[PDB]
Every structure is written in C-alpha cells, then in structure tokens.
RNA sequence: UUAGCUAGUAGGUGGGGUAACGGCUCACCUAGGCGACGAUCCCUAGCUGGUCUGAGAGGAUGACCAGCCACACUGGAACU
RNA sequence: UACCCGCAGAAGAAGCACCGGCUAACUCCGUGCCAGCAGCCGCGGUAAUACGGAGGGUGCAAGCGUUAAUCGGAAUUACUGGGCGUAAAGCGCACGCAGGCGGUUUGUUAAGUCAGAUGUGAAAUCCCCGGGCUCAACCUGGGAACUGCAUCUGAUACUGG
C-alpha cells in the first residue's frame, strides 16, 4: 500500500588522521497516496544500507494531509531553512507542476494536481521539509468550520 | 508616532494569539469597533467589549480551538503608507474562500463575501485566515 | 467624396470583400469610416455570401455617399432576395 | 514525415506491445519484446524523472504514429480546450481518421489504415477524405469507397479486428464497410497503461 | 525598497553587455586573416591551439579560434567568424566558420560534418 | 454645466495674468501609491482681482497668448 | 604548419634557450590518481 | 560626472497678418516666464494599434498588416 | 487553374544533431596533455562511454545543427516578490525646510474611493462559440476583450478638505 521513493543520495565525508572517511546519505519519502506523507534521511557507509535506514525513518514519523479530490485545499506557503516553497491547488488534469524533491513528496502524498514553486534554496532535504510543513499546515473547510464555530455551508 | 491604529490592533490580536492570552485590550475607535464586530460575526473571536467614556477601551476575547489559536493569520492590506482599494470584481479571496477579507465599503465595514453580495468594492483593511 | 465600396480581404484565389463606407481618396484596404456589410463571391451552398446592413447604407447615401457598381449590384440582389 | 524504420524495435524500446503489427502472430515470437534494441539491450539503466516522462510521450506518439511538432500542436489544442488536458489530448489522438479506420477494422495496423486513407479508399460522410490527421467528429459515418471494397487486405483487417476487443464508441458494419463515429471516446474506454499525466507534465518544462 | 524610495528613484535593470561585440549583433562577419598562429592554453590544459587574428569587415581587430584538425588559412585569407569563445584561451571570443569563404572544411571527418563544413561522402 | 478646475495662485506678477498650480492626486502605475502631482497653468484674469496663494476656479478657452489658454471664473479663499 | 607565437618578444642571443623559458616548454606535472593531489570531488563519470 | 535656462524671452496695449485663435509679426509699456514634479544641454529614437516572451505583474520590441507623423539628391524659397 | 477520372509500376523521393553529468542515448579500435573537444563543470599524460573512426543507440525530420538576438528560468532591481549584526548593504551624530505619514469625536463636504449609466476606446490582431477551403495552416460571421479616459447620476465606511 505504501509507495516509497528515494529523492537524493549524496556522498559526504569526515576527515581523519588517515585520510577521508566517506559515507552516504539517502533522502527518501514515502506515502500512501491519500493523506499520509513521511520523509526520511538515512546515513550509512554504503548506499543501500543508508537508503534502507532512510526508508525505515520515513515509515515512522509520517503525517496526515487534508486533500480535496487529489489536490490541495488552498494556496499554501511553506518554509524551512533557506527553502521557501509555494503551492497552489490546480484543476484536474493539470498534473503535478513541481520542481525537484518537491515533485516526489507530492506524488507519494497523493496530490495529483498542483502548481508549485520553490523559492529560496532548493536544497533537497530542506525543500522536502518545507513542502511537508506546508502540507501539514494546510487546513480543510470542515476544520475551519469547526474552529470558527460555523457550518461548512456558511463559510463556502 | 502611532501612525496606524487598525494595524496596531491587529498586531495586538496576533500577539495575544501567540501568547495564549484570554483577552486583548486597546484604545477604542469606531473603525476598530466595527472591525471587531465583523470578526465576531465571522467567528474569529468570542466577544468584544467597549468600556469607558472619556477614553474608552476595546476588550476583545480571543478564541482558541483544540489548544491552538483560531486567528491563524491576520494581515493588514491597506496601510497609511500605501492604500489599497478594490472594485467588486477585484475583491480578494483569502485562503481560497475559507479566510475572510475585511473591507470598508460605502455601506460600512464588512467581509469580502458580504461586499461581493452587495455589489460593491472598497478599501481592503485586512485579511484574516 | 465619401463612397461605399468593397475592400479586398481574403487569401490568394479566395477573395472576401468587406463593404466599407470611406472617403474615396483613402486606399482600398486602408482608412474607412464604417464597415456596413460583407460579400463573399466564393461562398458555398447553405451559407450567406452577402450581408449588407441596409439601413446604414441608406443613411450614408442620404448624407451624400456614392456607391460602387458592385456594391449597387449586391444591394439589388439583397432587395430581390428579400 | 513518417517513421519508415523497423516497428518492433520501437515496441522493444517502450517495453510494451504497441500494436505496430497485425497481431496474426504474437509479438514474443517475432522479437525479444522484453529486451531493448541494440548491443546494450540486456542492461537496464535506471531511468530519470525526465526520462520516464519522455518515454511515456514517445510510447503514445509511436502508438498513433504522430511526429513531434504535430503532437505538440495537439497538446496545445488540448490545453486550450475545456476539461482535463491529458484526456483531451487522448480524445484528439483517437479522432484522427486513420486511427478511427484502424479501430473500425479496415486496417490491420494503424499504418495500414493510414496508407488506405492516403490512397483515397475512405469516405467521411460520402466525401473522399485523404488526410490521416483528419479529426472525425461525432455522428460522422466513415466508409470504404466502392473501388477499394474489393481489396483482400480490407477483409483480412476486418477479420483481425473481430478477434480483437471492439470499441464501445464506434458502430461498424462488416458487410457494408461503413462505421459510425458515435461519440468521442471517454478515458475509461481507452487503455489504462497510458499515463497521459506524464505527457502533460513534460509539455510544462 | 520603501515604495516612496522606489517612486523617487526606480529600480535599475541590470544592463548586460555582449560578449561578442565585434559581431555587432550580426550572426557572422567576414574578415581578413591579419596573422595566423598557435598559442598555449591556460592551465590546466596543454595544447597548441590554432588561432587567427582577423581584421573584420566592420573595422574590429579580433582574434578567432580555428576548430577541426588542420586548416588551410594563412595571411590574407578571407574568412567568416561566428562567435563563441574558447575558454582556455585568453581573449578568444569567436570561432571561424569551417566551409565558408577561404576556410576549408575539415579533411576526412565523418561525424558532426556540418559543424566542420564537410560534405556527405557519396557512395 | 462646464468643465472647470481649482488651484492656488503661485504667481500674479504678469499683468492680467496669473499662474495657477493645480494639484491632481493620481495613483502610481506600478507601485500603487497615490502621489500629489502638480499642473502649473498660465491663466488670464481681467481686472487683476486675484492675490498670490489665493484659491481660484478656472476654465479652458481659446488661447489668449503663447502660454495662456485658461481663464478664471471665480476666486475663493482669498485670505492673507 | 602554423607559427608558435612566443611570449619573448624579439629574440636576440639564442632562440631555443628563449623558448625553454616560455610557456610552451613549461613544466607539466600530472594530477595524482592516488596520493597527494588525488582527491576527486566527482568522478569522470559521476 | 548636464543646474541653472530665456529679451519676442513672459505678460499687457494698439496696429498689421492668418481661413482661423495666438509674440504669428511690429511699435510702445510692464519685468517677467521656465526649472530638483528635472528646466537647459548631451546621447539615442519615427509614434500607436500591435509583436515576442511571461502564470501574472512586468521585460523586450515596433519587419509584414492598418492608423498617424516626417522626408523625396543637399540647403533654401515661394508660385499655382 | 482548383477539383475529378484513367494509366503504369514500389516504382522518382531521408537527412541532421547528439550519446561524461546537466540530458534521452554505450561499446570496440586509433591516439597518448598530442591531436583535438567544450555551453558550464571539465576531458586528453597508453586500457578515453568526453578527442577521431566504426558498430549500436537517442532525439528531431524535409529538415537538422551552429551563430546572433529577446524574454524566460533570474524572487539575480523583488509593484505582485528580496534584503542590510557576522555573507554586498544603517549616513559618525544630530537639527531641520521641501516631501511622506498622522491620536480621538461630531458635523459638513464629496477630491480620492466605490456603484450604475452615457460617449469613446478604429479595423486587423489575442481569446470564445460558429462557418468556409478534403484537414490544417489560412480565410471568415457574431461575441467577448481593449484592464483606460471623460461626463452625468448616486453611496459616504475608509483617506482628503
Ligand atoms: Mg582525536
Ligand atoms: Mg512539416
Ligand atoms: Mg485543458
Ligand atoms: Mg493683437
Ligand atoms: Mg486687429
Ligand atoms: Mg533616426
Ligand atoms: Mg516570472
Ligand atoms: Mg539616393
Ligand atoms: Mg530641396
Ligand atoms: Mg556530453
Ligand atoms: Mg542519460
Ligand atoms: Mg562532439
Ligand atoms: Mg583507448
Ligand atoms: Mg566522441
Ligand atoms: Mg525578473
Ligand atoms: Mg538577497
Ligand atoms: Mg569581512
Ligand atoms: Mg559586511
Ligand atoms: Mg550608527
Ligand atoms: Mg485619522
Ligand atoms: Mg467623487
Ligand atoms: Mg466610475
Ligand atoms: Mg480593435
Ligand atoms: Mg471546417
Ligand atoms: Mg470624509
Ligand atoms: Mg473627515
């Protein structure tokens, strides 16, 4: 049921008396294609292990997202570190118009129709974080009704 | 100097929301009062209360739901440094219609939707989400 | 003087004339006062080839507007048809 | 303006069967359908985000036999049109006269159908249409003209079609050799393996 | 930044100069080889890169790279230059066009022939 | 009813003539700020009734000199 | 055969010597594949 | 990294001139007029409908087509 | 002439770029920091998917590449939509004219603002629904739009007087 996919795998180094110690970082992101999305950042001496770790991380600490008919509910901004991200719901058939890490995260989440843009840094790890944040914050009509103490028909 | 009272009020509200304060008080004005009323109608606050004769103080009772603040965002739009007026076809939709935009029309301060219904534009005071 | 005439506006071998009121001095497809109809000599079956806003034409004539021979013919045709 | 090269190579590249041959003989017998064309076929490199979309686009284009500029134009048209873009594009593709003919069963392949169209074998509403890109409209009858009705190929094609699954959006008469394009097809009528969304995305970068 | 400030003095568009100003917004230009020579590239490369100093039709004295293996150019050899800089060469902003005017096409090239002015070997 | 404009008299030295600044309160094309823009006009006034700093209502007319194609209709707020 | 345009200006005493003190006959030291100047951020195919 | 510019110059009176208003012109009178909301000077440029690009706001642009302007070897002039 | 009918026979009709990463497409041979390549990063010093040839492949196709040029990506002049402790960026500090902004109440005004109308905003172009060329491009009917400006009649919360 959970579709998962690795955004970016990057080699990073620590330096020691001997010389350099290399290691791999794998940024993955998983989701059920409905509300749930979770990203994971695994690190290991070889790539596959790292990826596995990332996946494991991702599978726990998921997050639910209020989706309206396979898209967002309203235009939402999201930030993290340098990566400030904007994403706007769009008409059925537009497809995911989204850049980099962002595209991946959206797809697994289950948004099929978005217009996004990544402003600021487009550092994959931060940008995915930003996107997830945006998704999380984004409220539904029902939720807003509940909050403000009205019916959904009164708000529209 | 104080150059924007509405803005100040908004800021106060925001800070209250942040700090989990039950109520927020400020120097009352007519416009401010109107705004408060609008908010109440829309359900972003529980109540407001103007109190005093010589120098009266508006006291808004802030609203929280499931531990967090109802007024998620609350921005001035028109401001003294740069006024914004919109026509009925140009009236903004805040949060894709979920949030409200308080607009001062010829027939008084009202939400954006209300204005639209009426068939008139005006000075867009603020957005609330 | 002001005149009422066809202005050629189609493609090569497929002319479409816009009937225009215009100061005669102006070039054929150039400056014109009012466009008071059209005429399509290559018009197929089950479509109106000609259409003249006749009232406007009449008004122009009253004012003192000369009429192209072709335009006159078109007008006559229209009259007949109706 | 036409792809004149090997047909099964394309299929191999895509991965699927694109129906570029009549289907008398199974595609697994005619080629290594699983393995991609060339020296480095057995190797399967991991395909990029860009790449997959491109591949998808190619597949669709290959299926119908539309070159790129035309495809682009079609896409643009779809975008312009109201409703869902990918779906619209698909509909447009379907609408092509050659495609319609193929569906009806007068051509074994789409290529065959196209050829027939070119050679003035096909009448749309009792008027000989020659263009394969001709958009057939709803309630347009499309027929083999009397001169091309004696062709043994046509009957073979029809027979082949009979083996295949018939489309809901057409009604075709084998004896009369005339088919009515009843309505522009719905997305559910077309194949599920096509991810038009990818194609749509591609034309937005 | 302040709107008032902007009003007073608006935002300056960043005027970008061209990197091929001898062309003068022409796609190519004809010139005469003043001098034809080889030069060493800058680090980290090693070569003797063939290059020609050209007096252009529009007055300019530029220097132009000559791509492909081997060339017939020498002094007083009328050639077409096209723009494009060679990175490793200090100061070269233009390529000669192989197969225009006095410049010959490359000998025995079978791939990318159009770039080196070589005709299709008919068989 | 005729088109007419109001403005303060920036000068009244030249005889039978005054220059009348007209403030117009336009909105800026891009930035949206409302800027006070000014329009000096050489206005004709017979009898030299206007003072400097004086508010005055004026209308457009056939040109009376090289620079003077406006005439005044009535003076208002003529305090010093 | 094109002339090498040397950076010596007008050669007076000896040509070869002049050339030797020129970029054309500069020293070349190879980049280490392993050892000191050896670290590569990205491979040739990375 | 052009800050001051202007004497028919700004306005008035009266003649003359124009198809027509007008320093358009002339005589006299007044000393004005423009300018940091950029006068003057310098460089570049025909203007618009539009065109290209762009989510838009913008940016760039003004071949063709159509509207307007200016020019007709260079500089002047009038006649009809 | 368009268009239609007949005749013969697969007949007269495919190239161009690219294949290190970005970027879809990989191998062998030749060369050995040379020759050369290159948009950026870079490649080449004897096992080069980066040079040159070949085989194989990818993308476009009667075109395909290169150059020039513009906008885009570039939120990299940021009105929409950036910033300034340390990355570039707070005048050394003040006073203060022009300028920008202006606590609160009532009245009045109606300039800004908003609403409705009237006139105009040429036609073409753009867009929508149509129609005509076998289709398309192209042509074309009617709309919409031309975000503007002016005037008249209202509204008076907000800003101004
Ligand atoms: Mg230690
Ligand atoms: Mg073509
Ligand atoms: Mg669409
Ligand atoms: Mg006089
Ligand atoms: Mg007189
Ligand atoms: Mg010029
Ligand atoms: Mg943009
Ligand atoms: Mg001449
Ligand atoms: Mg002359
Ligand atoms: Mg490459
Ligand atoms: Mg690749
Ligand atoms: Mg190459
Ligand atoms: Mg080798
Ligand atoms: Mg090579
Ligand atoms: Mg920009
Ligand atoms: Mg910055
Ligand atoms: Mg420092
Ligand atoms: Mg600093
Ligand atoms: Mg300081
Ligand atoms: Mg106030
Ligand atoms: Mg008003
Ligand atoms: Mg109005
Ligand atoms: Mg128009
Ligand atoms: Mg049609
Ligand atoms: Mg008021
Ligand atoms: Mg007031």
Swiss-Prot record, chain C:
List the Gene Ontology MF annotations in alphabetical order.
DNA endonuclease activity; four-way junction DNA binding; structural constituent of ribosome
Q: GO terms for CC?
A: cytoplasm; cytosolic small ribosomal subunit; small ribosomal subunit
Classification via Gene3D superfamilies: 3.30.1320.10
Q: What induces it?
A: Part of the rpsP-rimM-trmD-rplS operon.
The record's annotation in SUPFAM superfamilies points to: Ribosomal protein S16
**What Pfam families does the record point to?**
Ribosomal_S16
UniProt keywords (A-Z) are:
Endonuclease, Hydrolase, Nuclease, Ribonucleoprotein, Ribosomal protein
Q: Extract the PROSITE patterns matched here.
A: RIBOSOMAL_S16
| Biological-process GO terms, alphabetical | cytoplasmic translation; ribosomal small subunit assembly
The UniProt function text for this chain reads: In addition to being a ribosomal protein, S16 also has a cation-dependent endonuclease activity. In-frame fusions with the ribosome maturation factor rimM suppress mutations in the latter (probably due to increased rimM expression) and are found in translationally active 70S ribosomes.
Q: Which PANTHER family match?
A: 30S RIBOSOMAL PROTEIN S16, SMALL RIBOSOMAL SUBUNIT PROTEIN BS16M
Similarity section: Belongs to the bacterial ribosomal protein bS16 family.
Q: How does it assemble?
A: Part of the 30S ribosomal subunit.
Q: What name appears for this protein in its UniProt entry? A: Small ribosomal subunit protein bS16
Q: Which organism was this protein described from?
A: Escherichia coli (strain K12)
Give me the gene this protein comes from.
Answer: rpsP
Curated annotation (Swiss-Prot), chain D:
The record, for PROSITE patterns, names: RIBOSOMAL_S4, S4
Which GO cellular component term is one of those annotated? small ribosomal subunit
Keyword Cytoplasm on this protein?
no
Answer whether the UniProt record assigns the keyword Transcription to this protein.
yes
Which keywords does this chain's UniProt record carry? Antibiotic resistance, Repressor, Ribonucleoprotein, Ribosomal protein, Ribosome biogenesis, RNA-binding, rRNA-binding, Transcription, Transcription antitermination, Transcription regulation, Transcription termination, Translation regulation
Entry-linked Pfam families:
Ribosomal_S4 (PF00163), S4 (PF01479)
Gene Ontology process terms (BP): cytoplasmic translation; DNA-templated transcription termination; maintenance of translational fidelity; negative regulation of translational initiation; response to antibiotic; ribosomal small subunit assembly; ribosomal small subunit biogenesis; transcription antitermination
Please name the SUPFAM superfamilies in this protein's record. Answer: Alpha-L RNA-binding motif
Q: Where is the signal peptide?
A: none
The protein's matches in SMART domains, at most eight in alphabetical order, are given as:
Ribosomal_S4, S4
Q: Which family does it belong to?
A: Belongs to the universal ribosomal protein uS4 family.
Q: Outline what the protein does.
A: One of two assembly initiator proteins for the 30S subunit, it binds directly to 16S rRNA where it nucleates assembly of the body of the 30S subunit.
Write down what this protein is called. Answer: Small ribosomal subunit protein uS4
Gene this protein is translated from: rpsD
From Swiss-Prot, chain E:
Q: Name one GO cellular component term.
A: ribosome
- Which keywords has UniProt assigned to this entry? Acetylation, Antibiotic resistance, Methylation, Ribonucleoprotein, Ribosomal protein, RNA-binding, rRNA-binding, tRNA-binding
GO BP field: cytoplasmic translation; Group I intron splicing; maintenance of translational fidelity; positive regulation of RNA splicing; response to antibiotic; RNA folding; translation
Q: List the disulfide bonds.
A: none
Q: Does the keyword RNA-binding apply?
A: yes
Q: Which residues carry this modification: N6-acetyllysine?
A: 107
* Result, substituting residue 56 to H: Protein is not incorporated into ribosomes
The molecular function terms in GO held by this entry are:
misfolded RNA binding; rRNA binding; structural constituent of ribosome; tRNA binding
* Pfam families xrefs: Ribosom_S12_S23
State the remark under miscellaneous. Answer: At least 19 substitutions or deletions in 11 codons can promote streptomycin resistance, dependence or pseudodependence; all but one of the streptomycin resistant mutations (K42R) are associated with hyperaccurate translation and thus reduced translational efficiency. The streptomycin sensitive allele is dominant to resistant alleles.
* HAMAP family, sorted: Ribosomal_uS12_B
Complexes and interactors: Part of the 30S ribosomal subunit. Contacts proteins S8 and S17. Interacts with ArfA. May interact with IF1 in the 30S initiation complex.
Family named by the database record: Belongs to the universal ribosomal protein uS12 family.
The protein depicted here goes by the name Small ribosomal subunit protein uS12
* Gene transcribed to yield this protein: rpsL
UniProtKB/Swiss-Prot annotation, chain G:
**Statement: the UniProt record of this protein carries the keyword RNA-binding:** yes
Q: Which domain of life is it from?
A: Bacteria
Record bears the keyword RNA-binding: yes
Arranged from A to Z, the UniProt key words for this protein are: RNA-binding, rRNA-binding, Translation regulation, tRNA-binding
Region of interest: Disordered:
30-46
Alphabetically, the GO molecular function entries are: ribosomal large subunit binding; rRNA binding; tRNA binding
Q: Which GO terms describe its biological process?
A: regulation of translation; rescue of stalled ribosome
Record note on disruption phenotype:
Cells lacking this gene are viable, but those lacking both arfA and ssrA are non-viable.
Q: What is the effect of changing residue 11 to N?
A: 90% decrease in kcat for peptidyl-transferase by RF2
- What segments bear the compositional bias annotation Basic residues? 33-46
Instruction: Please give the function described in this protein's UniProt entry.
Output: Rescues ribosomes stalled at the 3' end of non-stop mRNAs. This activity is crucial when the stalled ribosome cannot be rescued by the SsrA(tmRNA)-SmpB quality control system. Binds the 30S subunit, contacting 16S rRNA with the N-terminus near the decoding center and its C-terminus in the mRNA entry channel; contacts change in the presence of release factor 2 (RF2, also named PrfB). Requires RF2/PrfB to hydrolyze stalled peptidyl-tRNA on the ribosome; recruits and probably helps position RF2/PrfB correctly in the ribosomal A site so RF2's GGQ motif can hydrolyze the peptidyl-tRNA bond.
Assigned protein family? Belongs to the alternative ribosome-rescue factor A family.
| Subunit structure and binding partners | Interacts with the 50S ribosomal subunit. Interacts with RF2/PrfB on the ribosome. Contacts ribosomal protein S12 (rpsL).
Mind telling me what this protein is named? Alternative ribosome-rescue factor A
Q: What stretch of the whole protein does this chain cover?
A: 1 to 46 of 72
């Amino acid at each position: 049921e959970l579709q998962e996919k690795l955004i970016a795998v990057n080699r990073v180094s620590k330096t020691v008396k001997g010389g350099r110690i290399f290691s791999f970082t794998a940024l993955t992101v998983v989701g059920d294609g409905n509300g749930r999305v979770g990203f994971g950042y695994g690190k290991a001496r070889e790539v596959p292990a790292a990826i596995q770790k990332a996946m494991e991380k991702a599978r726990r600490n998921m997050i639910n997202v209020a989706l309206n008919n396979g898209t967002l509910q309203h235009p939402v901004k999201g930030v993290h570190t340098g990566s400030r991200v904007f994403m706007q719901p769009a008409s059925e058939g537009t497809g995911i118009i989204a850049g980099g890490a962002m595209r991946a995260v959206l797809e697994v989440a289950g948004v099929h129709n978005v217009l996004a843009k990544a402003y600021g840094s487009t550092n994959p790890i931060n940008v995915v974080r930003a996107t997830i944040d945006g998704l999380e914050n984004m409220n539904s009509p029902e939720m807003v009704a509940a909050k403000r103490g009205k019916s959904v028909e009164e708000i529209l | 100097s104080m150059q924007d009272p509405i803005a100040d009020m908004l800021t106060r509200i925001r800070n209250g929301q942040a700090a989990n304060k039950a109520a927020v008080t400020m120097p009352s004005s007519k416009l401010k009062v109107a705004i408060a009323n609008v908010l109440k109608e829309e359900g972003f606050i529980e109540d407001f209360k103007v109190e005093g004769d010589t120098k009266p103080e508006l006291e808004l009772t802030l609203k929280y739901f499931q531990g967090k603040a109802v007024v998620e965002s609350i921005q001035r739009v028109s401001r003294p440094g740069l006024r914004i007026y919109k026509r009925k076809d140009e009236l903004p939709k805040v949060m894709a219609g979920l949030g409200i935009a308080v607009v001062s029309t010829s027939k008084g301060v009202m939400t954006d939707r209300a204005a639209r219904q009426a068939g008139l534009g005006g000075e867009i005071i603020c957005y609330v989400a | 003087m002001v005149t009422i005439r066809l202005a050629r506006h189609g493609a090569k071998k497929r002319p479409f004339y816009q009937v225009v009121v215009a100061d005669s001095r102006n070039a054929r497809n150039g400056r014109f006062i009012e466009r008071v109809g059209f005429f399509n000599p290559i018009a197929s079956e089950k479509e109106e080839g000609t259409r003249l806003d006749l009232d406007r034409i009449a008004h122009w004539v009253g004012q003192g507007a000369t009429i192209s021979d072709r335009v006159a013919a078109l007008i006559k045709e229209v009259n007949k048809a109706a | 303006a036409r792809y004149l090269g090997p047909k099964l190579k394309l299929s191999r590249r895509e991965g699927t069967d694109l129906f570029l041959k009549s289907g008398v003989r199974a595609i697994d017998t005619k080629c290594k359908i699983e393995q991609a064309p060339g020296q480095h076929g057995a190797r399967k490199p991991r395909l990029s985000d860009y790449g997959v979309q491109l591949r998808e686009k190619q597949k669709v284009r290959r299926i119908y036999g539309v070159l790129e500029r035309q495809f682009r134009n079609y896409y643009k048209e779809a975008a312009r049109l109201k409703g869902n873009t990918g779906e619209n594009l698909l509909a447009l593709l379907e609408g092509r006269l050659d495609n319609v003919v193929y569906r009806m069963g007068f051509g074994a392949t789409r290529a065959e159908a196209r050829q027939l169209v070119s050679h003035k074998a096909i009448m749309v509403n009792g008027r000989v249409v020659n263009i394969a890109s001709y958009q057939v409209s709803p309630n347009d009858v499309v027929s083999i003209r009397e001169k091309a009705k004696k062709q043994s190929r046509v009957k073979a094609a029809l027979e082949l079609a009979e083996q295949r699954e018939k489309p809901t959006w057409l009604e075709v008469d084998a004896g009369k050799m005339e088919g009515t394009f009843k309505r522009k097809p719905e997305r559910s009528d077309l194949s599920a393996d096509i991810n038009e969304h990818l194609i749509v995305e591609l034309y937005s970068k | 930044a302040t709107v008032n400030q902007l009003v007073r003095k608006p935002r300056a568009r960043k005027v970008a100069k061209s990197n091929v100003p001898a062309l003068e917004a022409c796609p190519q230009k004809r010139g005469v080889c003043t001098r034809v020579y080889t030069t060493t590239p800058k680090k980290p490369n090693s070569a003797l890169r063939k290059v020609c100093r050209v007096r252009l039709t529009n007055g300019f004295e530029v220097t132009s790279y000559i791509g492909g293996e081997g060339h017939n150019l020498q002094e007083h050899s009328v050639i077409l230059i096209r723009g494009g800089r060679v990175k490793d060469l200090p100061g070269v902003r233009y390529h000669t066009v192989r197969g225009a005017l006095d410049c010959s096409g490359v000998k025995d090239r079978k791939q990318a022939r159009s770039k080196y002015g070589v005709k299709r070997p008919k068989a | 009813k005729i088109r007419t404009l109001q403005g303060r008299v920036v000068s009244d030295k030249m005889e039978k003539s005054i220059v009348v600044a007209i403030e117009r309160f336009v909105k800026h094309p891009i930035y949206g700020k409302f800027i006070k823009r000014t329009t000096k006009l050489h206005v004709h006034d017979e009898n030299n009734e206007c003072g400097i700093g004086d508010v005055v209502e004026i209308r457009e007319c056939r040109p009376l000199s090289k620079t003077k194609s406006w005439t005044l209709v009535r003076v208002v707020e003529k305090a010093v | 055969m094109s002339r090498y345009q040397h950076t010596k200006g007008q050669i007076k005493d000896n040509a070869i010597e002049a050339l030797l003190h020129d970029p054309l006959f500069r020293q070349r030291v190879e980049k280490n594949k392993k050892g000191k100047g050896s670290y590569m951020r990205k491979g040739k195919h990375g």
